[PDB]
Design a protein around this ligand. Structure first.
Ligand SMILES: Cc1ccccc1[C@H]1CCCN1C(=O)c1cc(Cl)c(O)cc1O
Length: 210
């Protein structure tokens, strides 16, 4: 079955702001998502140091970027610690961290949207370039789940039937019509070079044939 949840009020407000505010520097979404993957990878590594068996679900720690022009999706995949169903629901929409209103209060006055990451809500910058975001995740302690939202104040969670991931999180950006530049090899390379040069895990940019 599919479960539908309301975003907490302030998160809905943030998402609307991200979608409606004129802001040309959209590329920062990729930095924020790679940062999130890096943090998740840090966590499973940290845990594996005391209990190595937590890598039984996959020893390699990496980030893959996978453009698909036919589906018009950009997918960020990591083999980080992943999220349980509860982690998913609690951290991707139903609970507003302090940084949510702090950020929007920051946008009032001087701050610009590129600072979003500093408030711990950088995930939502995905809606700078995506009309719908799907998050597939698998944590050692739980089943594989799919989160999805086109904003508008709700998201869904369901058990995922797709290819099993072993462990980690996959963010699938269904790109807006006018944002297909982020499917281009040279454009993604440029952004990763500029914003994510010192990530401590291998980042592989997959290519497509003509
Ligand atoms: C950083 C972060 C913020 C909010 C919730 C969860 C996370 C990370 C740490 C614990 C598990 N995790 C994730 O599974 C994860 C999530 C998102 Cl949103 C992503 O883009 C990539 C990921 O690997």
């Amino acid at each position: 079955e599919v479960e539908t949840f309301a975003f907490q009020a302030e998160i809905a407000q943030l998402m609307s702001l991200i979608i409606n505010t004129f802001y040309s520097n959209k590329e920062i979404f990729l930095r924020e998502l790679i940062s999130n993957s890096s943090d998740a990878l840090d966590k499973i590594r940290y845990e594996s140091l005391t209990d190595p068996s937590k890598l039984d679900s996959g020893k390699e720690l990496h980030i893959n970027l996978i453009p698909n022009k036919q589906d018009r999706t950009l997918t960020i995949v990591d083999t980080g610690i992943g999220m349980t169903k509860a982690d998913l629901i609690n951290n991707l929409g139903t609970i507003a961290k302090s940084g949510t209103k702090a950020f929007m209060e920051a946008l009032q006055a001087g701050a610009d949207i590129s600072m979003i990451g500093q408030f711990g809500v950088g995930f939502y910058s995905a809606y700078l370039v995506a009309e719908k975001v799907t998050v597939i995740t698998k944590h050692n302690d739980d089943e594989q789940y799919a989160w999805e939202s086109s904003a508008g104040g709700s998201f869904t969670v369901r058990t995922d039937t797709g290819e099993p991931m072993g462990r980690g999180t996959k963010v699938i950006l269904h790109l807006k019509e006018d944002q297909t530049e982020y499917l281009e090899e040279r454009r993604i390379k440029e952004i990763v070079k500029k914003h994510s040069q010192f990530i401590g895990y291998p980042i592989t940019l997959f290519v497509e044939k003509e």
